Amino acid sequence: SPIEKSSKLENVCYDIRGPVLKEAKRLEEEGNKVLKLNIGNPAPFGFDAPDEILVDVIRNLPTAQGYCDSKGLYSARKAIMQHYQARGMRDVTVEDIYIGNGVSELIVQAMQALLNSGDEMLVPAPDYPLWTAAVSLSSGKAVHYLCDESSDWFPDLDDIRAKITPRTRGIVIINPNNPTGAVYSKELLMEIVEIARQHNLIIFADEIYDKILYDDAEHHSIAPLAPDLLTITFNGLSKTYRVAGFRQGWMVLNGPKKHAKGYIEGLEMLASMRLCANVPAQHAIQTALGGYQSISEFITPGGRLYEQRNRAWELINDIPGVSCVKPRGALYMFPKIDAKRFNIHDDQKMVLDFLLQEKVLLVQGTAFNWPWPDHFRIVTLPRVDDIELSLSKFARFLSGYHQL
Amino acid sequence: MSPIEKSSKLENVCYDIRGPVLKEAKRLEEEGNKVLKLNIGNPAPFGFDAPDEILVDVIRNLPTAQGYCDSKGLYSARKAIMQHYQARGMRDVTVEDIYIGNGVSELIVQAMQALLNSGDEMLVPAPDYPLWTAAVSLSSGKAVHYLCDESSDWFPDLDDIRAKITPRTRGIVIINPNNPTGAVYSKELLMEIVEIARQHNLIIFADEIYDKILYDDAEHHSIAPLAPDLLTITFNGLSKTYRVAGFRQGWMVLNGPKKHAKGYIEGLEMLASMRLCANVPAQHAIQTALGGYQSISEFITPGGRLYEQRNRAWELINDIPGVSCVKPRGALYMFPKIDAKRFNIHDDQKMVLDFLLQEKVLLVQGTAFNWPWPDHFRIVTLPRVDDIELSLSKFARFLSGYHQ
Ligand SMILES: *Cc1c(COP(=O)(O)O)cnc(C)c1O
Ligand SMILES: *Cc1c(COP(=O)(O)O)cnc(C)c1O
């Protein structure tokens, strides 16, 4: 009598961490070093937490050993409140803010309390794979709207309107975008709002990279651009403040809310179930959002994030058969590859073949629900030396690669 | 502006250790009233401090734990858990069979999500820890409650279990030592539960998070070694025993023949990587807690505060007219029975609410633990004695002239 996985997991595929790592983990155990450009994890690439965060966590640790409120510490939620109040989200109270074990937990919770069987969620393609998985896990269906590579990976508005059904409950916006690195203009975001307003949709805004911007890139939160709509905004400390392991994220409810009291009680229900998010690291939030922002040094010209993005950009375009749109934010690149030139029918196989030959780990584009096997994603976190070595390996790999 | 209700999967979910009565208490606290909250097993506000050996290990390892770790958790942490259960006769367990989550709560939910399809039944004790019922319902499963026998030291009634087994039953939940009854099950009882699970091919889910909080000559028996031929999942953590609930550190261990449940395990691993990882810094405390000297021994012995508080609370609650209670041999709770007809109790939530409004003390009604009748409630034994009598002498005055 076999015990298979539940039906709610039949479509689920969040695997940036998938069966390719099985061979990667094997190579590592054998002693071979594998350059992992697959995960946006700051610490393995030499990114340390700001001292101020570490100091305040250590200081409050003996006082944070018990359960806190399910929504999180008041002072932390107060800091989050003030942060968004300085962006035009004035009516946000501490009761509109939920702190969880990273944004990941809250994304799932937000969908669990919302979706029923048959319900549809508009999700970008390419996506952040958790969003698709979360919707599916919540018994909803992820309907993918296309992002337009020829338009700097901006969402296709005509595609979004065309894929709206009477079952669409909301639309997911990931801005700045993982994995394209796109930074959406205010004009486009205003178009999304109009669509959401006309079709009675809830806007979910994953803005976890809103402070990782390059050059003249300017982040616009969609929440204060939709003051008359109920919107939910996600952000955290993982990427911007390089403390992914502390698991600290939050979601903020903005807009009219009395028509959504039922949904809110569902969220408060899911938060109460697990009692609370981890407490000691919540004391870091106030220090992170307040005072000096250390991320400014990394994204400015000369900063390692800026230079690594530039270096990966130069090398990936100097490869025959590969092009890419330059990221204006976040930590990723989503290069297009001439699938016909290399006879690529399975982009996962290409990733696997590249791993086995050059010991470098990428993520195939279809893992981000891109309909075609002509893309992949690289992370710009590694040192310039590592990026140069891995991309030259990739160039050598592709020069003699004809997928069988 | 159509109404946004909570999802259908949350319609039959409660977990009311935290809710409307709790909501009232906080209002009272805002309003200038000091309230003695005995609703939750939270050690820290009752003068319980983190084992300083745990603190110094987390502090020292904090700068090295900023990034994502393996989804199942830190290797050294899982190493300790493996060895801990190795010593208790589960000699086949490896690191791959261990999942570290943000407290046991997260793992309980995940374990149900990956297992249960719509209509699938899970045997859950009555009374239960309400998260179990919530997690089953949340996963679209049905929580089928088997009664525990108050006249038999709150032991599960084996006849009631067998009478409620249907072809839809997937597994059975065992909370041992028990929340809320504080019962410590015998090896002979646990052995018969194994026999039941063996005949009907049921997965055993063992919540053994109080396995080290024992009184008198009470001996804990893990059901996993007693069922070496069955798949069993055991839950435990640092929250209660090691008084660091706020750190949110728990683990679940898979034991037995796992080949026939490959799909279910793949589901667990999927849910496991969906959130990337559990909070990493506090995972360095597992090795410290599980090894060397156990500080919990000072609290449980006849000199310890937990032993004493358990005593004085049991004797005080029994002397109250119309109230009786079975003495707990473990955990941190009591589940007193009240003579409903004497006070005309038809709703136990209103009773707890009245006691809160009358005397600023917060309890939890028994129906919050899925007990079918309004003739029970729960007391936590964490407060040191001074507040135990205060609140119980308070509870005595309340009942002396109460009529619902
Ligand atoms: C990295 C990432 C997350 C994960 O956030 P956590 O706070 O670490 O859980 C969520 N969404 C996006 C788009 C991400 O890139
Ligand atoms: C307190 C408790 C939990 C929750 O444990 P955490 O690790 O803090 O999430 C789970 N099960 C039982 C029986 C409990 O008493």
- Which residue out of A278, A379, A381 would a mutagenesis test of the B interface target, given it has the greatest number of B Cβ atoms within 10 Å? A278
In short, whether A175's Cβ falls inside 6 Å of ligand 1 is no
Q: Identify the closest residue of chain B to A133 by CA–CA distance.
A: B274
The one-letter code for the residue type at A398 is L
B177: preceding bond cis by omega (within 30 degrees): yes
Place of tokens 């943000």: B102
Using the mean position of ligand 2's atoms as its centre, give its distance from the Cα of residue B105 in Å: 6
Kindly list the distances between the CA atom of residue A401 and the CA atoms of A34, A297, A319, A334, A336, in Å, as whole numbers in the listed order: 20, 39, 13, 20, 16
Question: What is the Cα–Cα distance from B395 to B404, expressed in whole angstroms?
Answer: 15
In short, whether A103's Cβ falls inside 6 Å of ligand 1 is yes
In short, whether B330's Cβ falls inside 6 Å of ligand 2 is no
Q: Is the Cβ of A39 closer than 8 Å to some Cβ of chain B?
A: yes
- CA of A41, nearest ligand number: 1
Q: Classify A52-293 by CATH class.
A: alpha beta
Question: What is the Cα–Cα distance from B146 to B372, expressed in whole angstroms?
Answer: 11
Please state the φ and ψ torsions of residue B125, each to the nearest 5 degrees: -65, 155
Q: Is the Cβ of B59 closer than 8 Å to some Cβ of chain A?
A: yes
Q: Residue A140: which of A119, A122, A124, A125 has the closest Cα?
A: A119
Place of tokens 């979004």: A160
Question: What is the Cα–Cα distance from B173 to A23, expressed in whole angstroms?
Answer: 37
Using the mean position of ligand 2's atoms as its centre, give its distance from the Cα of residue B208 in Å: 9
Burial environment of residue A42 by CB neighbours within 10 A (0 to 12, 13 to 18, 19 or more): buried
Torsion of CA A292, A295, A300, A303, to 10 degrees: 120
Please state the φ and ψ torsions of residue A321, each to the nearest 5 degrees: 95, 0
- CA of A331, nearest ligand number: 1
Per DSSP, the residues of A336-372 read EE-TTTTT-S-HHHHHHHHHHHH-EE-EEGGGGT-SS
Question: What is the Cα–Cα distance from B185 to A322, expressed in whole angstroms?
Answer: 65
Q: Identify the three-state secondary structure at position A89.
A: coil
Using the mean position of ligand 1's atoms as its centre, give its distance from the Cα of residue A104 in Å: 6
Using the mean position of ligand 1's atoms as its centre, give its distance from the Cα of residue B72 in Å: 18
**Which B-chain residues 246-265 have CB contacts (< 8 A) with chain A?**
246-248, 260-264
Query: Which atom of ligand 2 is the closest one to the Cα of A274?
Result: 9
Token pair of A328, please? 């204006």
A291 marked among binding-site residues: no
Query: Which atom of ligand 1 is the closest one to the Cα of A174?
Result: 13
Q: Residue B241: which of B220, B260, B223 has the closest Cα?
A: B220
Q: Identify the closest residue of chain B to A73 by CA–CA distance.
A: B246
The one-letter code for the residue type at B138 is L
Token pair of A403, please? 């997928």
Contact A259 B3 (CB under 8 A): yes
Residues 6+ apart with CB under 8 A from B62: A54, A57, A58, B281
Using the mean position of ligand 2's atoms as its centre, give its distance from the Cα of residue A9 in Å: 25
Contact list, B201 vs chain A (CB under 8 Å): 1
CATH 3.90.1150.10 fits A1-51+294-404, yes or no: yes
Instruction: Note whether A294 and A67 are within 8 A (CB).
Output: no
Please state the φ and ψ torsions of residue A364, each to the nearest 5 degrees: -70, 150
Residues 6+ apart with CB under 8 A from B394: B359, B361
In short, whether A192's Cβ falls inside 6 Å of ligand 1 is no
**Which B-chain residues 61-80 have CB contacts (< 8 A) with chain A?**
62-63, 65-69, 71
Instruction: Note whether B144 and A286 are within 8 A (CB).
Output: no
Please state the φ and ψ torsions of residue B126, each to the nearest 5 degrees: -130, 115
- Which residue out of B102, B118, B120, B137 would a mutagenesis test of the A interface target, given it has the greatest number of A Cβ atoms within 10 Å? B102
Question: For residue A93, how many other CB atoms are within 10 A of its CB?
Answer: 12
Domain B53-294 architecture: 3-Layer(aba) Sandwich (3.40)
Helix (H) or strand (E) holding A171: strand A168-174
**Which A-chain residues 191-230 have CB contacts (< 8 A) with chain B?**
200, 202, 230
Question: Which homologous superfamily does the CATH classification assign to the domain defined by B1-52+295-404?
Answer: Aspartate Aminotransferase, domain 1 (3.90.1150.10)
Q: Residue A378: which of A367, A356, A363 has the closest Cα?
A: A363
Token pair of B392, please? 């119980």
Known binding site for L-alanine: residues of B?
A: 41, 179, 378
Q: Domain extents for chain B? A: 1-52+295-404, 53-294
Contact A66 B246 (CB under 8 A): yes
Please state the φ and ψ torsions of residue B15, each to the nearest 5 degrees: 40, 75
Instruction: Note whether A158 and A145 are within 8 A (CB).
Output: no
Contact list, B51 vs chain A (CB under 8 Å): none
In short, whether B244's Cβ falls inside 6 Å of ligand 2 is no
In short, whether B105's Cβ falls inside 6 Å of ligand 2 is yes
Instruction: Note whether B43 and B245 are within 8 A (CB).
Output: yes
Residues 6+ apart with CB under 8 A from A77: A71, A94, A97, A99, A250
Q: Identify the three-state secondary structure at position A154.
A: strand
Contact list, A259 vs chain B (CB under 8 Å): 1-4
- Which residue out of B10, B136, B231 would a mutagenesis test of the A interface target, given it has the greatest number of A Cβ atoms within 10 Å? B10
In short, whether A206's Cβ falls inside 6 Å of ligand 1 is yes
**Domains B1-52+295-404 and B53-294 in one fold:** no
Please state the φ and ψ torsions of residue B207, each to the nearest 5 degrees: -90, 95
Protein residue whose Cα sits closest to atom 7 of ligand 1: A102
Q: Which of A47, A109, A204, A238 to mutate to test the pocket of ligand 1 (most atoms within 8 A of CB)?
A: A238
Closest residue to A65, CB basis, from B243, B263, B264: B243
- Which residue out of B14, B27, B39, B66 would a mutagenesis test of the A interface target, given it has the greatest number of A Cβ atoms within 10 Å? B66
Strands B36-37 and B361-362, bridge-based pairing? parallel
Instruction: Note whether B241 and B104 are within 8 A (CB).
Output: no
In short, whether B213's Cβ falls inside 6 Å of ligand 2 is no
Experimental method: X-ray
Q: Identify the closest residue of chain B to A115 by CA–CA distance.
A: B7
Q: Residue B362: which of B332, B337, B383, B385 has the closest Cα?
A: B383
Q: Identify the three-state secondary structure at position A305.
A: helix
Q: Is the Cβ of A243 closer than 8 Å to some Cβ of chain B?
A: yes
Instruction: Note whether A320 and A110 are within 8 A (CB).
Output: no
Contact B68 A244 (CB under 8 A): yes
Residues 6+ apart with CB under 8 A from A237: A53, A243, A246, A248, A249, A281, A284, A285, A288
Q: Which of B131, B154, B210, B238 to mutate to test the pocket of ligand 2 (most atoms within 8 A of CB)?
A: B131
- CA of A179, nearest ligand number: 1
Question: What is the Cα–Cα distance from A16 to A21, expressed in whole angstroms?
Answer: 9
Contact B266 A5 (CB under 8 A): yes
CA pseudo-torsion sign B98, B102, B104, B110: negative
**Resolution to 1 decimal place, in Å:** 2.1
A178 marked among binding-site residues: yes
Q: Identify the closest residue of chain B to A52 by CA–CA distance.
A: B63
Closest residue to A274, CB basis, from B50, B71, B105: B105
SS3 annotation, chain B: CCCCCCCHHHCCCCCCCCCHHHHHHHHHHHCCCCCEECCCCCCHHHCCCCCHHHHHHHHHHHHHCCCCCCCCCCHHHHHHHHHHHHCCCCCCCCHHHEEEECCHHHHHHHHHHCCCCCCCEEEEEECCCHHHHHHHHHCCCEEEEEEEEHHHCCEECHHHHHHCCCCCEEEEEEECCCCCCCCCCCHHHHHHHHHHHHHCCCEEEEECCCCCCECCCCCCCCHHHHCCCCCEEEEEECCCCCCCHHHCCEEEEEECCCHHHHHHHHHHHHHHHHCCCCCCHHHHHHHHHHCCCCCCHHHHCCCCHHHHHHHHHHHHHHHCCCEECCCCCECCEECCEECHHHHCCCCHHHHHHHHHHHHCEECEEHHHHCCCCCCEEEEECCCCHHHHHHHHHHHHHHHHCCCC
Q: Identify the three-state secondary structure at position A69.
A: coil
Q: Which residues of B292-317 are buried (b: 16+ CB within 10 A; e: fewer)?
A: eeeebeebbeeeebbbbbbbebbebb
Contact B280 A62 (CB under 8 A): no
Q: Identify the three-state secondary structure at position A26.
A: helix
Token pair of B273, please? 């990587």
Distance of CA B275 to the CA centre of its chain: 23
Question: What is the Cα–Cα distance from B154 to B180, expressed in whole angstroms?
Answer: 10
Contact A112 B9 (CB under 8 A): yes
Token pair of A1, please? 């009598």
Q: Residue B146: which of B174, B108, B120, B170 has the closest Cα?
A: B174
Token pair of A92, please? 């946000």
